Amino acid sequence: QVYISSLALLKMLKHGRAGVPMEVMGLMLGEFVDDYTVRVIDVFAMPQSGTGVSVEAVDPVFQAKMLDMLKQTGRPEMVVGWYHSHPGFGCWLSGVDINTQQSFEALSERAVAVVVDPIQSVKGKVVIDAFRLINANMMPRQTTSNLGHLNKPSIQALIHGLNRHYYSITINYRKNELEQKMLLLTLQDYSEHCKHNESVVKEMLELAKNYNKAVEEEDKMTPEQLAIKNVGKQDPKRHLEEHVDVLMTSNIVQCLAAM
Amino acid sequence: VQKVVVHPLVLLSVVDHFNRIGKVGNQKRVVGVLLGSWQKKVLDVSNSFAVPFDEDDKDDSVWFLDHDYLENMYGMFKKVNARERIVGWYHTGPKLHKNDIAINELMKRYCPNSVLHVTSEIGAEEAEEVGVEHLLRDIKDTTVGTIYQLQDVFNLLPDVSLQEFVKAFYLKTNDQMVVVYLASLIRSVVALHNLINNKIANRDAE
Amino acid sequence: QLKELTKQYEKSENDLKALQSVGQIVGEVLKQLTEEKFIVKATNGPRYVVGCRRQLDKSKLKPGTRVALDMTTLTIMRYLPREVDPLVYNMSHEDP
Amino acid sequence: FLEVQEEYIKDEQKNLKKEFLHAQEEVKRIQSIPLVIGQFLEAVDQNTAIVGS
Amino acid sequence: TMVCVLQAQQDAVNIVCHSKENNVGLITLANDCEVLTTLTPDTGRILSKLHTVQPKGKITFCTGIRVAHLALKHRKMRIIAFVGSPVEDNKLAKRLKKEKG
Amino acid sequence: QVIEYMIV
Amino acid sequence: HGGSLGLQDVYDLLKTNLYQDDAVTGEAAGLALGLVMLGSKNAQAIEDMVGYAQETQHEKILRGLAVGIALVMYGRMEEADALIESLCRDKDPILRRSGMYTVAMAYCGSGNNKAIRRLLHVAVSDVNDDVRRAAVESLGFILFRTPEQCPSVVSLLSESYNPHVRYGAAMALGICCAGTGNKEAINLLEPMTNDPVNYVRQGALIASALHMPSVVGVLVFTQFWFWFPL
Amino acid sequence: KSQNLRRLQAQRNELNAKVRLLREELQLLQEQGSYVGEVVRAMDKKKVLVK
């Protein structure tokens, strides 16, 4: 349903992550065709107060004047709606609703905002969700059976009690091949080759002595998964595997390119 | 003086900007300024306007402005974030000429370092790669899951002189080969330990 | 009829903008400037890991510094100097 | 036909390695500011314990 | 409009700003081009160019015609072109025939 | 030995 | 849009009116293609539907690459198989979805297993849990006449990660035993049910519930996304 | 070929079970933490009397 250019996603994460928690805000720009398919191309970072920002961020001269400026040498069409930048927890909007819900119909019903999370999303899967005006009207969309993943939110009572008003739908994504593609020696005996095969073979010596002690010891009188893998005195044997792995990616490969 | 780092924030911004100006005609060196922290190695982290580029179509001897518009977006992003200073400016790929060095010089106003050349490094995207690693789906990063100068070029080429160097090269290879032989052994042993673990496991599951 | 209400009423508009504020819990940073995240000790509270202000002066955040922390999100705020009790009812006043 | 789904299994092993080493990465959101620290005491089994907050 | 640029040029620019949203401007007919301003309802800061004014160099007409051509093209348009100087010779007429208090 | 130089 | 659902001139009228709906015109176009598609397998029509100026912000990739696949099945199976191409490699996820759908009747009679296999590797290369849904749909629509073996094929691929494809498998194999209760459907149903997989639950339900026009009505029945009209 | 194929089924099902409890592991840890304590022992129908 709701679409994004994902430049709005990166400027979104930029403005959010830059200003935590401070709940930074802004408002994006796009176009409407039907019920709720909203292409969002650019988010507009409206400025920050001291520590608590509200409807006062809806300024005359900043969004009006700069909407004229990047209307001229940039994004031409009308705005969509706002956003909000929840740090930490996730998505529920208690004091946010009185500062956001009444603002929409001043413009249009074709107006969404979105709460994001640049703290708990360290991921490559960032928490994004728009919503509705279900302040009132408890009075269609076959969806293939209610869309799936909003019968799986973090089902928490204050969140789901917020979801009575909220009703998120989807977040689509676009990108192009160009952008995709874009994003996608030596050292020899300085001291290097010696002093990382003079090092690691010594831990292979006495760590293989402790591997000897491990195989001698656990051979008999062993039960219950070696007392839960020796959480204590970690860790024999695997250490040897790791050591073996470290040199054979190094003492060959760039040495190979030496040839 | 250090090099440049990168943030693909400005890369997606300029790429979307040439998705903007790509109407009928107008293959244009669209110059827009950057704002961000400038110090030792940086990127000038965020883009700006352009005052879009048109000369005649190729007669590139006439300019774009305002300096008050420089401090429109650069001035009123200070109301949003105050960490920034202009150095960076871009244009299209890949051709440059005296127009571009004349906007380095003529429209200078700070810009000591701004190549979009020794400052040549295309960065890491610190602390905001969450908006990159979500944007690195189908086909993935690797796959994830998988005359004077040229006169001085060949001054440092010739080496077949194997007496000394050859012997040395032979030797090092031998020593490192040995290391690998030593290793490729203890992982074979611990692999065999996993074999007897699996065989006694399924042997007891009989 | 207007300057009176402007001065001694519009000066008292400050109650809403100050009423918007939220207050900040205090604590002592057990240092370990774990770079992007520090471990602080609240006063009657647990030790725990906190993120940072992102343009704070980290280089002088010494182990054993009173720092103010956010309540809901809990990121560290503006620092504090080392406190004093009502030792103000001790030093600042006696029988001289 | 049993050669058909032979090409299925190799692709599924490869792609489950793709999203598997991609799938040790979605668990790293639960470690996020701010998390209370409290010392570890006795381990009892596999992935549970009796940590002391 | 867009007005190009020590006694005649001073007076001719000082009244032409506030003579007539019909935004003012101030460019030159100099070398490598100075624009200094755009279409803005602020008119008096053109007078700010009068403080530290310095005509010292060479005049080029057609390039400044290209300056007002662009800066007024990407906004009616009017090119006010002051001259007290010999303009040498070299498309200037026939390009803008389809251009148009 | 570049041809000669299974581990994966 | 409704009018098309209810039922050369007709075709072109639909296009004109179906190429303007942009709500009613989307569903209308879908229905139009469906009841006019048959099996023309003509270059003109194909390219026309394919290139509706990239977007025309139409309902989900033109009802899921409707026109193309529909007409392909409508006229043939060999030429339709040849076309699978665009959607299959088409950049847009929707294009690929459409391709999968078309490879929906193309080579029925459990046909060119080369094609099947190819689809199968695309059936696990899908960007998300959708295109995979379409892959399952195609699977179910093929392995038509033959079966008892279909269950085994779907068996291993039935349950896995991204619990959207799991449900898809159901429909893909559901069709195989329309028809009949067993050929391993019952065996591979109970285990799949009673699970959070929200979409999966519904898939199980429909499987439990479960000639050229009868071919079509199930092929569109996996467009359980859009509205009711199935 | 079918026997070796079912060995590959064992490999694929094993890795798929790994990604099962990793995926529902990352949604799983959003639940609660059990307490711990000594008791004086029960008397009756269910019962404990913990402390």
- Has A86 been labeled as part of a binding site? yes
Tokens 């959207």 belong to residue = G164
* Direct distance between the N- and C-terminal alpha carbons of chain H, in angstroms, rounded to an integer: 62
Q: Does the beta-carbon distance from D45 to A228 stay under 8 Å? A: yes
Tokens 């269950």 belong to residue = G151
Closest CA to G153 of G125, G123, G193: G123
A touches G (3+ CB pairs < 8 Å)? yes
- Has A84 been labeled as part of a binding site? yes
- Encode burial over G29-49: b for 16+ CB neighbours within 10 A, e otherwise: bbbbbbbbbebbbeeebbeeb
Q: Output the DSSP codes for H1-51.
A: -HHHHHHHHHHHHHHHHHHHHHHHHHHHTTS-------B----SSS---B-
Tokens 């979307």 belong to residue = B16
SS3 per-residue string spanning D4-49: CCHHHHHHHHHHHHHHHHCCCCHHHHCCCCCEECCCCCCECCCCCE
Cα of G84 vs its chain's centroid, Å: 12
Instruction: Provide φ and ψ at B114, rounded to 5°.
Output: -170, 55
Residues of D engaging A, defined by a Cβ cutoff of 8 Å: 25-26, 28-29, 32-34, 43-46
Experimental approach taken = cryo-EM
Query: To 10 degrees, the CA torsion angle through A166, A170, A171, A173?
Result: -170
The rounded radius of gyration (Å) of the Cα atoms in chain A is 28
What tokens appear for G225 in the block? 């996304």
Q: Does the beta-carbon distance from E36 to B65 stay under 8 Å? A: yes
Q: Is the peptide bond before B158 cis (omega within 30 degrees of 0)?
A: no
D16 touches chain G (CB under 8 A): yes
Q: How many CA atoms lie within 13 A of G177 on its CB side?
A: 23
SS3 per-residue string spanning chain A: CCCCCCHHHHHHHHHHHHCCCCCCCEEEEEEECCCCCEEEEEEECCCCCCCCCCHHHCCCHHHHHHHHHHHHCCCCCCEEEEEECCCCCCCCCHHHHHHHHHHHHHHCCCCCCEEECCCCCCCCCCCEEECCCCCCCCCCCCCCCCCCCCCCCCCCHHHHHHHHHHCCCCCCCCCCHHHHHHHCCCCCCCCCCHHHCCCHHHHHHHHHHHHHHHHHHCCCCCCHHHHHHCCCCCCCCHHHHHHHHHHHCCCCHHHHHHC
Q: What is the largest CA-CA distance in chain E?
A: 38
Q: What is the largest CA-CA distance in chain C?
A: 60
Query: Chain B residues with CB inside 8 Å of E36's CB?
Result: 65, 67
C41 touches chain D (CB under 8 A): no
- CB-CB contact of G89 with G53 (8 Å): no
Q: Is the peptide bond before B94 cis (omega within 30 degrees of 0)?
A: yes
- Has A243 been labeled as part of a binding site? no
- Encode burial over C63-74: b for 16+ CB neighbours within 10 A, e otherwise: eebebebbeebb
User: What is the C-alpha to C-alpha distance for residues G138 and D24, in angstroms, rounded to an integer?
Assistant: 32
